[PDB]
C-alpha cells in the first residue's frame, strides 16, 4: 500500500492527480480515498499513509492544493470518520454540543505552520496556472483562520505601513516642489534652515527608493516567479520597483550634472501617488473597487485603445496629407493631438484653413467624430457595465487572495519580533491514539448552531 | 408561568430574545408562543401574560419590534385563535363574510396610541441597529394604518408646510439679492418703501433660521440619538440645523460690522434650496428618486472621489514640480484646477510652456486623462447602473419609513389642535370576555375578497 | 334568464362586471358563462342571450372589452362548443384538417363592422382607465385581423400621407427661409418669378395649417376625450394642433403689420419637423424607438429636470448675491446661463472676478459641478438603462395600439372611396342553424400546424 | 423506395423539406429517417439511398445544411446504428475504450472534400436566408475540424497576409505624406534618391489597389451573391473594393492633370486603415469586439442618427430663419455646424447676436440641447448597454463563421501549393462492408472521457 512509482506517487497521489473537479469525479475520488485510507489503517495502524511524500516532496494534501483540486482539498480538510476502530484519521471533531449549539475543531497539522509546504503558503504563492485558486480559500477552516490572523496582529502592522508610506510620499512631494532652479546640479548647500530641511527630505526620499529596490529584488529571488507569472500576477511589485528605478536613475543623472533628472523624479512622484492605491486591500469595499479597476484596465481599455489608436492614426494621416500649409498644422503630432481633443470634448472643427478642398476635410472629421465619439466611447461604457455585472464575486475572491498574501508576507517578515508568539489555534487534547497515548493537536475551534438537527 | 428572571424577562420575552428570524426558528418560536399562551389562558384565565413587562418596560410585542424580529411581530399582529374556550387571545377577527367577500378586524391595542412604547413609534424611531426595520412596516395592519393616517389629515399639513417653506426661501432669496453694497454693516434704514420691504424680508429670514435652530435642538433632546445614529440616520435634521447655524453666524458677523457675513448667508441660501428636496417624500416617485440620490452619494461618489483626489493630487504635484516658471502656473492650486478642468470637458493640453521637457509633461497629462476621464468616470456610470438595478425595493421601503416618521412627528406636534379627534379605527364590540362582559376594542376594519375559499 | 336589473345588466353582464382578471376568477367566470349559455340554449333555442344589451347599449363582449377584462374577452372570442345539440353558440370552427395541418375560422360578428360598438373600435378608442388595453389586442383573431388590414390597403395610404407631409414641410421651410427682410409686413408682391414661388409656398403652408386646425377640432368633437384623456393620451393630436395654432397666429400678426410673426412661424417650423417622428409608427423598429423616447421624456427627464432646476436656481442665486460688480454678470439670467453651460461641457470656472471672497465662489461652483455634472447626469444615464431594460415589451404593445388607431382612423376617413369594398374575411357557410336553415358568417380563416396532436 | 417525384425529391428529401426545427418535429423526423434507412438497407443492401440526389444535385445532408435544418443535420452527422445487420449506415464509431476514456471516429464523407457541395462550403457560403446558420457550425465534428484546419496551416497564412497588408498601408501612408505640392500632376521625376523611393511607393500602392479590385471582381463572379446578400453580408469585400476604386480614380485624375486626385487618395488611405480591423478575426476577443461594433453601427447608430438629423435640421432651419444678419451666420451649413458642436461638447450659446428676439433664440437652443444632448445621447448609451447584454453569444458565433469563411477561402487559394497535402483526418479501416470487403474511410478521431458510464 506504501509502494511508490517512478515519480514517487502513491495510490493517494495517483487519485489526486486523477481528479478533474467534476462532481461525479469528485464524489468517486473522495469515496475511493476514504476507502483506501480506512483499509490501510485497518491493515497497518502503525504506518502513516498521508505522511508519505512523492519525489517532489509534496503530500496528497499539498499536491491537491498546488494542482487546484478544490473538491479533494475540501474533502480532506473537513474529513470526519466516526468509526470507533479508526477515528484518528479524521481532521474534524465535535468538542461538545449543548443542543442547538455545537463546537467543532479543525486540525491545522499542515495548514499554517508546516515546515516545507504549508497549504496556505502554497495557494497564495501560486503561479495562476491552477484553474481556480480564488475559490480555494473559501473552504471553512482557511477563511476563518486568515480572518483571525488579520484581526489579531496583521491589521495594525498594515495600518502602520500605510501611515509610513503616506509620510514618505508627503516628504518626497515637498522636497521635489521646492527644488532649486538656478544652475546645474548638484546644488551647493546653504546655511538656510529651509535648505537643511530640503536636503533631509531628499535623503529620505532616496533611502525609500533604494529600500523598495532591494525589496523587489528579494521578492524576485524568493518567489522565483516564472516569466508569465511575472507578467500576469505581480503588478504591484513591478510598479514599486519601477518607481524605485526612476528615483535611482534620477540620482544618477543628478550627480552626473545632467538636468534631465527632474523628468525621472516627476514620473516616480506620480507613480508613487498612484501606488497608494495598493493600500485599498485592507478595506473590503475599496479593495473590491480597485480589483474592478484592474480588470477594466486589462480588458476594456486595452481593446478600446487598440481600435481607437488605429482609427486616430488613419484619419490623422489622411488629414495631414490633405493639408498643404502654403500655425503650421502640417505635422502628424499636431494633427493627432487636435483629433484627440475631440475625445475629451474640446474639438475644433475649424482648426485650420490650409487646404484646397473643404468638403473632404469636413467629411473626414465628421466620420472620425461619429466613429470614435458617438460609437466607441458609449460602446465602452456599455462594455464596462456588462463586465461590472459579471465580476461581482470574482473581485471579492481576488481581494481575499490579495489580503492573504499580505498576511503571509507580513507574518514572514516579523519572525524576529515574534517567531511563534502569534500562533493560531491552541493545543488541545482530542482523544487517544490507538497506541493508548494522548492525542494533542493544534486545533482551531469553531461554534455553529443548527436548529434542524436538534 | 408569570415568573420573572433577573432582567425581568418572562418565558415569552425569552422566546422573543431567542428568535433570529430564520424560517425554522420563526415557525418553532411561533408554535411555542401559541402553545404557551393557550396553556396559560387555560390555567389562569384572569391573569394577562402579554401585559407583563420586563425591567425595561417593554412587552413581548414591543420587544420584538425594537429588536427587529419581523417573524414574531408578524405572527403576533395577525394571531387568530379559533378555539371556543379561548378566542380573546386572538388579535385578528372576521366581522362577516358575504361569500367571496370577507371583512376582518385588527386590534390596535398598542399599535397606535399605546402610552409608553407604541409599536409604530418604536419602529420609526429606531437607531438602525436592527437588521431589518424597513420590512417591518410591510405587515398588513401597519401599512394600511399609516396610509389611512396620511390620506386623512397629515397630507394637507405636509402640503401647507411645503408651501410655507417655499415662501420663506423666496423671501430670503429676494432679500439677499437686493442687499446693500455701499459701506460696512449695519446699513442705515431709509424711508424708501423698497428698503422697508428689504428689512421685512431680512427679519423674516432670521426668524425662520432661529426657528429651525430650536427645532433641531428639540429633536436632539427628544430623540436622544446616539453618536452613530447622529452620523448615519438624521441627515435632514443636520442639514436644516447647519443652514440655521450659517444664518445665525451671518447675523452675528453683520452686527459685528464684519463684511464676511455675506459668505455665510450665501451658503445658507444654497443649502436652503437643496433642502427643498426633503419635501419629495410626500410623493412616491420623487421620494424614491431622492432615496436613490442619497444612496449614490453615500457609496459611489465617496469611493470615486477618494480615488480621483488621490490621482489628481499626485499628477498635480508632478506637473507643478516639472514646471519652472522662468501666467504663473507654478502653484499647486492652479495646476490642480487646470487638471480638474479635464473632468468637466474643458481641459487645455497646452496650458503652459514654462517647462524644459515637453515629452514628460505631455505623457503625464495623457496618463491622467486616460486614468480619470476614460476609465474612472465611465466606470462610475457603470457602478451607478449596478446600484440602481440593486436598490429598486429598498428605496421604496426607505421612502415608506421617511413618510411614516413624518406622519408621527406631525401627529405629535398637533396634539393641541386635536389630541384625539383624529384617531384611527373605531370602537366596536367584538365578542364577550370569559367573565361574561362585553369586549370593546378600537378595531381597524379591512375588506378582502377570496375566490378560492368560497 | 333574459331578466334585466335596474341598470339593465343580465346574468352574463353581471358575470362580466364581476371578473377582476385573476386566474381563479377567470376560470370560474368562464365556466359559469359557458354553463349558463348552454343551459339557456337548451331551454330557449329561439332567443339570443348575447344579443341582449344593457341600458348603455353594451353587450357582454363589448362590456368586457371596454372594462379591460382580457380573460373573459379571450374566452369569448375563442369559444368552441363541440356539443352536437348546440354548436351554433361557438365562435371558433375547424374548416378541415389534413393531418398535421388544420384550418380554423373566426366569426367577426362584432369584431370589425358592428354598427354601434365594435370591439376593435372600443379597445383602440379607450381612455386608458382600463388596466390593460395594450395586451387586449394580443388575442389571436384581432392581431391577425389588424395585420391583414395593414398589409392590404392602409400601408399605401400611410406612405402617401407621409410623403405629402414631407413635401409640405419642405415647402414651408423654403418659403420661410426666403422671407423678405425690408420693411414691415405685408410685403408688396413683385413680378419676379421667385416672388411668385414664395407666395405660392406661403399660401400652401397656411392651407396645411388650417387643415390641421380643423382636423384637430373634429378629432376633439368625435372622440369627446376626457380632460385626463386629453392630457395623457392624445399627445400627437395636441402637438399638430399647437403647430397649426402657431401658424394661424403668425398669419394674424402678419396682416396686423406686427413684425413678431416670425417668432410664431419659426416655432411652428421646428415643431413640424419634430412631428415628422409621428410617422415612425409605420415601421416596427423606429416606432418602438419613438415609444421609448416618449417614456423617457415622461419619467426620467421630468424627475431629473425638477431636481436640476432646483439646484441650478439655488446656486445661481447664491453666486449672484456674492457678486458685487463694483461684463455685468450681476444678473440672475446671466449667472443661470453660465452655470447651465457647465452641463453641456462649456463651463468657465473663472467667468467673473467681481467678488470679494474667491474661496466662497470657487467652493459654490465646485459643489454645483459635483452635484449636477458628476452625480445627476450619470445617475440619469443609469436610470435610462434601467427603464430600457424594463419597457421592452410594453413599447411593442403600445406601438401596436398606435398602428391600430391609425388603421381605424384611415378606414373611417376613406368610407366614401370604399365603404365596404375593403372588408376583411369572407362570407362562408359554416353549418346549419337548429331551425334547419344555412349558417352564413363573415369568417376569417387561419392555418395552424400541430405535430403533437396528429 | 428510390422513386423520385417531379422535383426529384426522395422520401428522405421530403422528410428534410418537412422539418421546421421544432423539438417534436425534430424527434419525429429523425425517428422516421432512421426507420426508413434501416428498412431500405434490409430490403436493398446493394443500393445507396443517401447517394441519390434531387434535380438540383443536393443530397439530404446537403439539403438540410442549405435549408438551415440544424436538428436533422445534427442527427445525420452523429448517427450511430448498433444493429449487427446494418452498422455501415452509421457515421459515428467508437475505435476503443480504456474504461473512463473513449475514442470516437467521424466520417467526413462529404463534410470537407466533397466535390460538388461540401457541407462546410455550403454553410459558410450561405446567403443568410436560412434562419440559423450561426448555430450550425456548433455541432461536434465541424467545430473541431475547423479548429484543426486553423491550428494546422491557415493561421500562419493569415498572419503573413496581415503583415503584408500592414506593410502596404505603411508604404501608402509614407508615399502620400511626401507628395509633391508644386504645380499640376503628373510631376516630373528627379535624380534625388528620395524621389525614387516616393515613386516606388506610389507604384506599389497602385499595384495593391488593382489587386484588390480584381479580387473583389472574382469574389463577385465566384460567389454570385444576390442583391440582398450583397447589401447585408459582404461588407468587407465591398469596403476593400471601394478603397481600390478610390485609388484607381485617383490614378485616373492624376494622369488627367486634375488636382482633385488628392481627395480620392486620402479617402482610400483612411478606409485602408479602418479596414485593418478586418484582421481582428484571427483573434477571439478582438473579433468578438469587432462583431459588436458592427451590430451597434447597424442598429443603434442608424436609429439615433435618423432622429438626431431630423431634430438638427429642424432647429437649424428655425434658427437660420430667425437670424437677420443686418460672421455671416445667415447660412444653413454654418448654423447646422454650430448646433452640431453642442454634441461634441463645444457649443456656444452666444454664437451670434444678429437677431431681433433673444428669448426665441435662447429657447430654441435650450430645447435643442435638452432634446439631443441630455436625452438622446444618454438614451443611446443605455440602448448600447441593452444590446451588449443581448448579443454576447451571437457575436461569438458570427466570429466563428467569419473565421470559417477565411479558412475555406485560404484553402481554396492555395490549391496549387498543396492540393491535398493538407487534408484533415486520416484513412482508417473501420470494419467490413456486408459484401465482405474492407471499409476504409477518412475519419477524424476524437477523445472523450466519461466517468458516469464506466
Ligand atoms: C511629516 C511631513 C512634514 C513636511 C510637510 C509639509 C511641508 C511644509 C513646508 C512649507 C514651508 C513654507 C515654504 C517656504 O517658504 O520655505 C521653503 C523652504 O523649504 C522647505 O520648507 C522644504 C520642506 C521639506 C520637507 C521635509 C521634512 C523633513 C523633516 C521630517 C523655501 O524657502
Ligand atoms: C411672497 C413672496 C413676495 C416677494 C417676491 C418677489 C420679489 C419682487 C421684487 C421686485 C421689485 C423690483 C426691484 C426694485 O427696483 O426694487 C428694489 C427694492 O427692494 C425690494 O423690492 C426687496 C424685496 C423684498 C421681498 C420681501 C417680501 C416682504 C413682504 C411679504 C430696489 O429698489
Ligand atoms: C416639392 C418641393 C419644391 C421646393 C424645393 C426647394 C427650394 C429650391 C429653391 C432654390 C432656388 C435658389 C434661390 C434663389 O436665388 O431664389 C430665391 C427665390 O425664392 C425661391 O426660390 C422660393 C422657393 C419657394 C418654394 C415653394 C414651391 C412652390 C411650387 C410647388 C431668391 O431669389
Ligand atoms: C517597409 C516600410 C518602409 C518605409 C517606412 C517609412 C518611411 C521613412 C521615410 C523618412 C525619411 C525622412 C524624410 C525626408 O527628408 O525625405 C523625404 C524623401 O521621401 C521619402 O523618404 C519617401 C519614402 C517612401 C517610402 C516607400 C518605400 C519603398 C521601399 C520598400 C523628402 O526629402
Curated annotation (Swiss-Prot), chains A, B, C, D:
Q: Where are the ANK repeats?
A: 9-45, 59-82, 117-139
Tell me where on the tree of life, at the top rank, the source sits.
Eukaryota
Show which stretch of the intact protein is covered: 277 to 752 of 838
What is known about its processing and modification?
A: Phosphorylation by CAMKII seems to regulate binding to vanilloids. Phosphorylated and modulated by PRKCE, PRKCM and probably PRKCZ. Dephosphorylation by calcineurin seems to lead to receptor desensitization and phosphorylation by CAMKII recovers activity.
Q: What is its biological role?
A: Non-selective calcium permeant cation channel involved in detection of noxious chemical and thermal stimuli. Seems to mediate proton influx and may be involved in intracellular acidosis in nociceptive neurons. Involved in mediation of inflammatory pain and hyperalgesia. Sensitized by a phosphatidylinositol second messenger system activated by receptor tyrosine kinases, which involves PKC isozymes and PCL. Activation by vanilloids, like capsaicin, and temperatures higher than 42 degrees Celsius.
Segments dipping into the membrane but not crossing it run: 329-351
**Note in the entry:** Responses evoked by capsaicin, but not by low pH and heat, can be antagonized by capsazepine.
Result after altering residue 274 to I = Reduces sensitivity to capsaicin 10-fold; no effect on sensitivity to resiniferatoxin. Reduces binding to resiniferatoxin
**Binding of Na(+) 2, residues:** 345
Q: What is the effect of changing residue 406 to A?
A: No effect on PMA-induced enhancement of capsaicin-evoked currents but reduces direct activation by PMA
What is the annotated quaternary arrangement, including any partners?
Homotetramer. Interacts with PIRT. May also form a heteromeric channel with TRPV3. Interacts with CALM, PRKCM and CSK. Interacts with PRKCG and NTRK1, probably by forming a trimeric complex. Interacts with the Scolopendra mutilans RhTx toxin. Interacts with the spider Tau-theraphotoxin-Hs1a. Interacts with TMEM100. Interacts with PACS2.
**Keywords attached to this entry:** ANK repeat, ATP-binding, Calcium, Calcium channel, Calcium transport, Calmodulin-binding, Cell membrane, Cell projection, Glycoprotein, Ion channel, Ion transport, Lipid-binding, Membrane, Metal-binding, Nucleotide-binding, Phosphoprotein, Postsynaptic cell membrane, Repeat, Sodium, Synapse, Transmembrane, Transmembrane helix, Transport
Explain the regulation of its activity: Channel activity is activated via the interaction with PIRT and phosphatidylinositol 4,5-bisphosphate (PIP2). Both PIRT and PIP2 are required to activate channel activity. The channel is sensitized by ATP binding. Repeated stimulation with capsaicin gives rise to progressively smaller responses, due to desensitization. This desensitization is triggered by the influx of calcium ions and is inhibited by elevated ATP levels. Ca(2+) and CALM displace ATP from its binding site and trigger a conformation change that leads to a closed, desensitized channel.
Q: Which residues carry this modification: Phosphoserine?
A: 226
Key word Glycoprotein present = yes
Q: Give the family from UniProt.
A: Belongs to the transient receptor (TC 1.A.4) family. TrpV subfamily. TRPV1 sub-subfamily.
Notes on the domains: The association domain (AD) is necessary for self-association.
Please give the name of this protein.
Answer: Transient receptor potential cation channel subfamily V member 1
Extracellular-facing ranges: 178-195, 256-259, 352-359
Impact of mutating residue 346 to Y? Slightly modifies channel permeability
Impact of changing residue 338 to K on the protein? Abolishes channel activity. Restored channel activity
Q: Which gene encodes it?
A: Trpv1
**MF GO annotations:** ATP binding; calcium channel activity; calmodulin binding; chloride channel regulator activity; excitatory extracellular ligand-gated monoatomic ion channel activity; extracellular ligand-gated monoatomic ion channel activity; identical protein binding; intracellularly gated calcium channel activity
Q: How does it sit in the membrane?
A: Multi-pass membrane protein
Q: Which GO terms describe its biological process?
A: behavioral response to pain; calcium ion import across plasma membrane; calcium ion transmembrane transport; calcium ion transport; cellular response to acidic pH; cellular response to alkaloid; cellular response to ATP; cellular response to cytokine stimulus
Query: Where does this chain carry the motif Selectivity filter?
Result: 345-348
Q: Which residues lie within the region annotated AD?
A: 386-414
Sites of Phosphothreonine modification: 94, 406
Amino acid at each position: 500500500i506504501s509502494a511508490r512509482d517512478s515519480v514517487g506517487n502513491t495510490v493517494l497521489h495517483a487519485l489526486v492527480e486523477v481528479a478533474d473537479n467534476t462532481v461525479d469525479n469528485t464524489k468517486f475520488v473522495t469515496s475511493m480515498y476514504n476507502e483506501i485510507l480506512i483499509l490501510g489503517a485497518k491493515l497497518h495502524p502503525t504506518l502513516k499513509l498521508e505522511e508519505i511524500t512523492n519525489r517532489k516532496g509534496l503530500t496528497p494534501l499539498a499536491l491537491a492544493a498546488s494542482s487546484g483540486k478544490i473538491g479533494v482539498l475540501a474533502y480532506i480538510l473537513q474529513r470526519e470518520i466516526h468509526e470507533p476502530e479508526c477515528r484518528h484519521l479524521s481532521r474534524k471533531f465535535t468538542e461538545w454540543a449543548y443542543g442547538p449549539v455545537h463546537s467543532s475543531l479543525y486540525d491545522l497539522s499542515c495548514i499554517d505552520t508546516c515546515e516545507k509546504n504549508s497549504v496556505l503558503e502554497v495557494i497564495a504563492y501560486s503561479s495562476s496556472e491552477t484553474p481556480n485558486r480564488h475559490d480555494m480559500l473559501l473552504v471553512e477552516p482557511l477563511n476563518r483562520l486568515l480572518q483571525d490572523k488579520w484581526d489579531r496582529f496583521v491589521k495594525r502592522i498594515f495600518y502602520f505601513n500605510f501611515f509610513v508610506y503616506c509620510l514618505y510620499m508627503i516628504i518626497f512631494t515637498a522636497a521635489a516642489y521646492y527644488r532649486p532652479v538656478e544652475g546645474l546640479p548638484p546644488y551647493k548647500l546653504k546655511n538656510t534652515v529651509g535648505d537643511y530641511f530640503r536636503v533631509t527630505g531628499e535623503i529620505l526620499s532616496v533611502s525609500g527608493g533604494v529600500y523598495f529596490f532591494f525589496r523587489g529584488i528579494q521578492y524576485f529571488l524568493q518567489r522565483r516567479p516564472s516569466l508569465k507569472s511575472l507578467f500576469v500576477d505581480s503588478y504591484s511589485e513591478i510598479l514599486f520597483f519601477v518607481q524605485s528605478l526612476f528615483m535611482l536613475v534620477s540620482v544618477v543623472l543628478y550627480f552626473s550634472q545632467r538636468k534631465e533628472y527632474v523628468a525621472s523624479m516627476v514620473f516616480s512622484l506620480a507613480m508613487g501617488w498612484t501606488n497608494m492605491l495598493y493600500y485599498t486591500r485592507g478595506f473590503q469595499q475599496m479593495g473590491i473597487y480597485a480589483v474592478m479597476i484592474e480588470k477594466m484596465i486589462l480588458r476594456d481599455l486595452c481593446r478600446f485603445m487598440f481600435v481607437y489608436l488605429v482609427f486616430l492614426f488613419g484619419f490623422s494621416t489622411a488629414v495631414v496629407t490633405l493639408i498643404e500649409d502654403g500655425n503650421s498644422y502640417n505635422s502628424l503630432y499636431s494633427t493627432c493631438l487636435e483629433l484627440f481633443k475631440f475625445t475629451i470634448g474640446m474639438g475644433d472643427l475649424e482648426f485650420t484653413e490650409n487646404y484646397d478642398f473643404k468638403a473632404v476635410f469636413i467629411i473626414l472629421l465628421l466620420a472620425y467624430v461619429i466613429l470614435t465619439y458617438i460609437l466607441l466611447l458609449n460602446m465602452l461604457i456599455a462594455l464596462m457595465g456588462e463586465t461590472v455585472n459579471k465580476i461581482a464575486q470574482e473581485s471579492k475572491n481576488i481581494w481575499k487572495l490579495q489580503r492573504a498574501i499580505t498576511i503571509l508576507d507580513t507574518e514572514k517578515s516579523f519572525l524576529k519580533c515574534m517567531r511563534k508568539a502569534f500562533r493560531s489555534g491552541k493545543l488541545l487534547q482530542v482523544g487517544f491514539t490507538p497506541d493508548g497515548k494522548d492525542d494533542y493537536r493544534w486545533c482551531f475551534r469553531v461554534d455553529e448552531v443548527n436548529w434542524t438537527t436538534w
